[PDB]
Amino acid sequence: RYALGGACRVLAGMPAPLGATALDGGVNFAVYSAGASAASLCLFTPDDLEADEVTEEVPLDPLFNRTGNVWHVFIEGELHNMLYGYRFDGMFAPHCGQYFDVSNVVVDPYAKAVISRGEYGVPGPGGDCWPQMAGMIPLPYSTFDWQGDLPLRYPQKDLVIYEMHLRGFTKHSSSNVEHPGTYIGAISKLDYLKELGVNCVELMPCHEFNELEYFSCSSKMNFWGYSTINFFSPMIRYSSGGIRNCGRDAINEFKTFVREAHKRGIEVIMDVVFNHTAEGNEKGPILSFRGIDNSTYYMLAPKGEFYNYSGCGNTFNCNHPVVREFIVDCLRYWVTEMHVDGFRFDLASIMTRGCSGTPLATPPLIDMISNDPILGDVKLIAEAWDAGGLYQVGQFPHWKIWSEWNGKYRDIVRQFIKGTDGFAGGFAECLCGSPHLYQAGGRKPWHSINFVCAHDGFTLADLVTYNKKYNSSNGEDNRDGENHNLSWNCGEEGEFAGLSVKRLRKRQMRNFFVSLMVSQGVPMFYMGDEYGHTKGGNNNTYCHDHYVNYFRWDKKEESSDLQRFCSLMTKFRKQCESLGLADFPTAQRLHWHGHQPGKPDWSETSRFVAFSTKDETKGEIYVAFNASHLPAVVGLPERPGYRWEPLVDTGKPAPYDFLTDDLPDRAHAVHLFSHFLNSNLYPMLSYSSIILELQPDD
Amino acid sequence: RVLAGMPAPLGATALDGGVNFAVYSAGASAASLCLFTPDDLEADEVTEEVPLDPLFNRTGNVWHVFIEGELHNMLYGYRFDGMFAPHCGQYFDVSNVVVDPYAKAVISRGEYGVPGPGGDCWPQMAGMIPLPYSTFDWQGDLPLRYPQKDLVIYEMHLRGFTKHSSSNVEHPGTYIGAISKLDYLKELGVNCVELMPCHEFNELEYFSCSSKMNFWGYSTINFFSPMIRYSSGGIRNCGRDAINEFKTFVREAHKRGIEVIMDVVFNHTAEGNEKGPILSFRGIDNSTYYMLNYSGCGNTFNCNHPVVREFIVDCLRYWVTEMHVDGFRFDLALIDMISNDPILGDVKLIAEGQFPHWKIWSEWNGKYRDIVRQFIKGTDGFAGGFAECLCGSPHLYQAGGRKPWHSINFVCAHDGFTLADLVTYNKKYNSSNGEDNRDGENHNLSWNCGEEGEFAGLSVKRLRKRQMRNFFVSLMVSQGVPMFYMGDEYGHTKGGNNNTYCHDHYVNYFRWDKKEESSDLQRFCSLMTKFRKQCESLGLADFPTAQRLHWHGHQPGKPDWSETSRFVAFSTKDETKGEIYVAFNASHLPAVVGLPERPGYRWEPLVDTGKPAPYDFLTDDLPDRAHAVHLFSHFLNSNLYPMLSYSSIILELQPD
């Protein structure tokens, strides 16, 4: 046949590879739809797509343009300036699970760019929020230069992770970047992270999503982005190019980001959400999979009701034979072409469920992922829990590869440092990387990702300022977010407290950071914790394109003492050999002390934890935490012929809370405590911690 | 020409040109006046003798003789005789020549430690004939009359003060050798200097027996005469130069603002019992002047007798008016007479709660020394006693109608361990006294701070420095009059010997060499003396009241008086520093102590005996003071302070 006025020949094509692929002076399209009775290929143009008008349509022959359940067609010519979609026909029965309709033009799941809008937060032509979408037709060749980029391949034990929101990182006016809120605005700030000690960035979801899902209903916005439309394409409204050049520019922008990050020694880990899609339940848009083969992609009940183990309306059928191949191809695409270094899986315990619902001991999807020759060399971090009731923390089909977030760490550290009884043994266990959870099954201490604050919940500053949540601007009447925050307002609630309360809060924040940085495992903290970012007591800000979610670069200058403390702690962890251990610590390296050396207090009323550990580069170090409300003079280990020299004391005023060989009068400061240090003594305030280093006494 | 004579004065005087000699006796049936020439006295020959008539030259029991002429270059004695019955109580003998009890000078020897011809330790003595006119210029003088509550007494031995070769003085070990160093004392803050006995005494009294010498000088021959062998002139000019040199000292001291308190011993004399030579008293009236052994010397001076009482009163008046002495100490101590005398009533009378008071007689507080030595070293049950001592011992003096400044506080003296020995030795080492280490106090209440002796570790030495500073702080914050002993301010040590009465050796000298090596302790002591004399609360005229003095423990307002308590803290309301907080930690464990809460104010470090010098006492002369306070501001802001074991601290309340 012919497609465009006789210029393009139409042929049978090939059923693989799926998607649209350029070759042989033409483009081959292939899709999978088992339940379709008729299919046609729709072609738009940039001008007609913004009219909801199809410029061309090629009907597909069920005989010569279908192999098995895979429709395919080859069109000769240069279509790389056009956008495409599919029209399917067939059975329609919501109560049976069929959602075919000829009036809808759907987007290929394998499309590498989805073009519907170019401006963030700006409705469509006439106040619309769900305009027509179309996918990008590839080009015969690539148009990006990597400049010899190669994988960094850091050992996971050497990582310090930083969780970043791409828009909120530079969208505040104080960022003073050329393109605030985009992939290029982020690049100008990468050196800052490099000086902070960060060598790994975790991006919050940067896959195509609609920020205007809720805008029509209640004028809210999907700021965080945990509702994905397509998985092969980056968010085009996080780029400066926009829909320009059919989206190719946006792709290159993302690539640019990654490349630059590798030239500063920073790795990029993508946050992916495969457990649900933007299409919602039966009352929602038909953009994608639902319109192609619903029964194949979504997990339904026998009566046609969608299984909802995420709270978002549906549940992706992760373990179905086709869905597993789709997911593996997504991951390999993001690794081999966008040069990503690893992935984080949100609500990971939905990929371990049956393709009905029943948790699987050896899920096929995890099996394929961990056995892949390409995905075996990249980091895989799992947030092992879901909204249905599963908590696979410590028990996850890890295959001796998968890492995992540690929420027990968060709870234990929060309660201990706030001053709860019965948490000294748990805190001591946390400081060693939880051997009882990861050593038994054959995993190393660095398979645990440690954190005390994330994007969901109180920030580090709110953790020491508010007893309760204040989610009133969310519009839910406080009926949202965590109810048990394990926080302490340090004696007076709100930001307007006395000077003693403020000093105590500063001590507490420094104590949390020290706990993170001296523990075995991979530390992680959310952007803005290094300078005390606050959200006003709101622990669930999923819908605020407001300054509360933005990095405040002006406030970073007012609190640069805390930033200095945090960067110095990261440097110290990097230097100390004993803090990045590959294996679990042993009783021959690590010793536990109490108020007196060698006499730990593991009882239920204990609120003091101290240890000392040998080190090949620093000789030996001593760390202590006093979470009681009364000060104490503690005795230090006896080391004939050596002396303990102070390094870190969170109770002292800056810059003396961390001593470096840049202070003009460090020796005088040490001398004025020498009369305690010579006796192997050290006085400590309530709610503090100290780090000392052993040096030759000569 | 020999004339009759008159009873008054009971001595020798140059009035009525000529000399009138009068002597009281009770059994002198024969009496004559011997006159010696100094060259003849050296040869032990009498060059003149004037017999006295029992009727023409005697009124009642007083012999008289008046000689018209010039005897200014002549010495004298008496040929008294009468009943001789040692087994009955009489010691009259004409063959011997005695010295007038009221003689102002005694001329036997002129070089300290150098015996007479053929090694004679007891050569013949004679008295000096006075002049009818004065010879010394006071350059204008008047009593300083300091209130006794404002004193800081410094006990010094005259010879040992500037006899060591490191003193670098023109006349080491004399009266005029210590005048140079008086300025040094003024730098320490000494308001008063107390002299160990400077009456005429024989340093070779028992040198013939064994080989020991008498160094301290607690044995008196003449009560009117200064020690001539402590002067550069010696016997020159009949000794009248010596009496002037002493005066010079007093004068110069009064020009530095320092008073002079004289240590007197009227409870025994060098006469011995019946074995030593008869110098005076026994050869005139051995009954009136002696109680025919409670002093430990061999005799007592019969304080209770009208003749003896008048003698003592006249001696004290002579010293006060002729020599301008400001006060007296009475060893091992008539009383009403002295206290009611027109002149001696305004003199500072100090006696070594049981001694008659009359609201005048101060006392050496020997109970203070025992309690303070036992609290500071660490001992159970002394928290209450220590707190009592800090308030001037009300239970001893307030009850009797006295004042806190009638208590003389000390922890060290000339007998016993020095300050450095209290923290160095646990036993006494008197084997150098040649008495089988049996002569000496056995209950020293000391502690070697761990290892005993001068060769210990570093921690022991640090603890010793802390302990010495703690003792001095204890002294300087207490209500009463503090006293120190020569050399404590730099760590003088006797080598463990707590009784050096018989050593004219470097152990009894002021080692000016060492004071240049322990200058940090001297700095601390001088600064503490400055601190005491500025505060109003530390020199109170009346006992502290509950309205101004408050007692604290590890927590403000919660003192621990139990038998396990080893921590004492208080705060006082001042009017020149606002308010001061003092704390003592005699426990072996460090401690963080909470300070009293004062809205709108903050406590600022002043004294901390655990810190290294010069930061053990903060002063504006220290350029780093602000940074040092800043580095403890994080404890100070919350009303906390960390303390080492065995340490004390002083803080001031500032409007911050």
CA atoms in the 13 A half-sphere facing the CB of B408: 24
CB contact under 8 A, A675 and B628: no
Q: Exposed, middle or buried: residue B564 (CB in 10 Å: 0-12, 13-18, 19+)?
A: exposed
Q: Which of A500, A653, A675 sits opposite B644 (nearest CB)?
A: A675
The CA distance from B550 to the nearest CA of chain A, in Å, is 24
CB contact under 8 A, A675 and B612: yes
For A586-696, CATH gives: 2.60.40.1180
Q: How many CB pairs under 8 A join A and B?
A: 53
Best to test chain A binding among B465, B644, B647 (most A CBs inside 10 Å): B644
Q: For residue A26, what are its two tokens?
A: 């033409």
CATH class of B2-128: mainly beta
CB contact under 8 A, A503 and B637: yes
Q: Which helix (H) or strand (E) holds A645?
A: strand A642-649
CB contact under 8 A, B644 and A678: no
Among the listed residues B48, B93, B310, B331, the single catalytic one is: B331
CB contact under 8 A, B631 and A669: yes
Q: Exposed, middle or buried: residue A308 (CB in 10 Å: 0-12, 13-18, 19+)?
A: middle
The CA distance from A608 to the nearest CA of chain B, in Å, is 17
The CA distance from B465 to the nearest CA of chain A, in Å, is 13
What are the DSSP E strand ranges found in A407-551?
A: 448-450, 522-526
CB contact under 8 A, A633 and B590: yes
Residues of chain B in contact with residue A501, where contact means CB-CB under 8 angstroms, are: none
Closest residue, chain B, to A682 (C-alpha)? B642
Closest residue, chain A, to B624 (C-alpha)? A668
CB-based contact A427:A516 (threshold 8 Å):
no
Q: For residue B40, what are its two tokens?
A: 């003849």
Closest residue, chain A, to B625 (C-alpha)? A672
Intervals of CATH 2.60.40.1180 along chain B: 549-654
The CA distance from B647 to the nearest CA of chain A, in Å, is 12
CB-based contact B288:B26 (threshold 8 Å):
yes
CB contact under 8 A, B631 and A665: no
CB-based contact A608:A624 (threshold 8 Å):
yes
CB contact under 8 A, B633 and A653: yes
Residue B544's Cα: distance from chain center in Å? 28
Rounded-to-integer distance, Cα A133 and Cα A243, Å: 11
Q: Exposed, middle or buried: residue B279 (CB in 10 Å: 0-12, 13-18, 19+)?
A: buried
Q: For residue B570, what are its two tokens?
A: 């208080």
C-alpha to C-alpha distances, B216 to A117, B279, B328, B446, nearest whole angstrom: 110, 20, 17, 24
Residues of chain B in contact with residue A675, where contact means CB-CB under 8 angstroms, are: 610-612, 644
**Residue with token string 């970073």:** A556
Method: cryo-EM
CB contact under 8 A, B640 and A668: no
* Neighbour tally for B455: CB within 10 Å: 7
The B-side interface with A (CB below 8 A) comprises 458-459, 462, 590-592, 610-612, 615, 624, 627-628, 630-635, 637-638, 640, 642, 644
CB-based contact B219:B272 (threshold 8 Å):
no
CB contact under 8 A, B615 and A651: no
**Cβ neighbours of residue A698 closer than 8 Å, sequence gap 6 or more:** none
C-alpha to C-alpha distances, A215 to A119, A543, B654, nearest whole angstrom: 15, 10, 61
CB-based contact B319:B263 (threshold 8 Å):
no
Which positions of A are catalytic? 346, 383
Which has the closest alpha carbon to A625: A471, A493, A517?
A: A517
Best to test chain A binding among B469, B608, B634, B645 (most A CBs inside 10 Å): B634
CATH of B549-654, one of 3.20.20.10, 2.40.30.160, 2.60.40.1180, 1.20.59.10: 2.60.40.1180
CB contact under 8 A, A679 and B644: yes
Q: Which of B459, B592, B638 sits opposite A683 (nearest CB)?
A: B592
Q: What's the reported resolution, in angstroms, to a tenth?
A: 2.7
The residue type found at A489 is: N
Residues of chain B in contact with residue A674, where contact means CB-CB under 8 angstroms, are: 612
Intervals of CATH 2.60.40.10 along chain B: 2-128
In the CATH hierarchy, which fold is given to the domain comprising A10-136?
Answer: Immunoglobulin-like (2.60.40)
B531-562: b (≥16 Cβ within 10 Å) or e: bbeebebbbbeebbeeeebbbbbbebeebbee
Closest residue, chain A, to B629 (C-alpha)? A672
A133 backbone dihedrals φ, ψ, rounded to 5°: -115, 155
Which has the closest alpha carbon to A381: A400, A405, A407, A349?
A: A405
CB contact under 8 A, B591 and A633: yes
Intervals of CATH 2.60.40.1180 along chain A: 586-696
C-alpha to C-alpha distances, B298 to A620, B210, B265, B276, nearest whole angstrom: 72, 19, 14, 10
B378: left (phi over 0), alpha (psi -120 to 50) or beta: left
Which has the closest alpha carbon to B38: B239, B336, B275?
A: B239
Full DSSP string of B400-423 = TT--GGGEEE-S--SSS--HHHHT
Sign of CA dihedral B304, B307, B308, B309: positive
CB contact under 8 A, A631 and B592: yes
**Residue with token string 């935490």:** A625
Intervals of CATH 2.60.40.10 along chain A: 10-136
A359: left (phi over 0), alpha (psi -120 to 50) or beta: beta
Long-range contacts of B88-93 (CB under 8 A, 24+ apart): B89/B286, B89/B287, B89/B292, B90/B27, B90/B286, B90/B287, B91/B274, B91/B278, B91/B282, B91/B283, B91/B286, B92/B27, B92/B28, B92/B283, B93/B278, B93/B283
Radius of gyration of chain A (CA): 28
Residues of chain B in contact with residue A631, where contact means CB-CB under 8 angstroms, are: 592, 635, 640, 642
CB-based contact B218:B263 (threshold 8 Å):
no
**Cβ neighbours of residue B534 closer than 8 Å, sequence gap 6 or more:** B576, B577
CB contact under 8 A, A685 and B635: yes
The A-side interface with B (CB below 8 A) comprises 500, 503, 631-633, 651-653, 656, 665, 668-669, 671-676, 678-679, 681, 683, 685
Rounded-to-integer distance, Cα B151 and Cα A70, Å: 112
Q: Which of B458, B640, B644 sits opposite A631 (nearest CB)?
A: B640
Q: Does the annotation mark B331 as catalytic?
A: yes
Residues of chain A in contact with residue B458, where contact means CB-CB under 8 angstroms, are: 678
CB contact under 8 A, B610 and A672: no
Tell me whether the omega of the peptide bond preceding residue B556 falls within 30 degrees of 0, making it cis.
Answer: no
Among the listed residues B310, B352, B452, B604, the single catalytic one is: B352
Residues of chain A in contact with residue B637, where contact means CB-CB under 8 angstroms, are: 500, 503
The CA distance from A692 to the nearest CA of chain B, in Å, is 17
What is the bridge-based pairing of β-strands B12-13 and A66-67?
Answer: unpaired
Rounded-to-integer distance, Cα A635 and Cα A682, Å: 7
**Residue with token string 């206290």:** B339
The CA distance from A624 to the nearest CA of chain B, in Å, is 18
A239 backbone dihedrals φ, ψ, rounded to 5°: -120, 155
CB-based contact A225:A277 (threshold 8 Å):
no
Residues just before a chain gap in chain B (C–N exceeding 2.5 Å) are 292, 333, 352
Residues of chain B in contact with residue A669, where contact means CB-CB under 8 angstroms, are: 631
Best to test chain A binding among B458, B592, B635, B643 (most A CBs inside 10 Å): B592
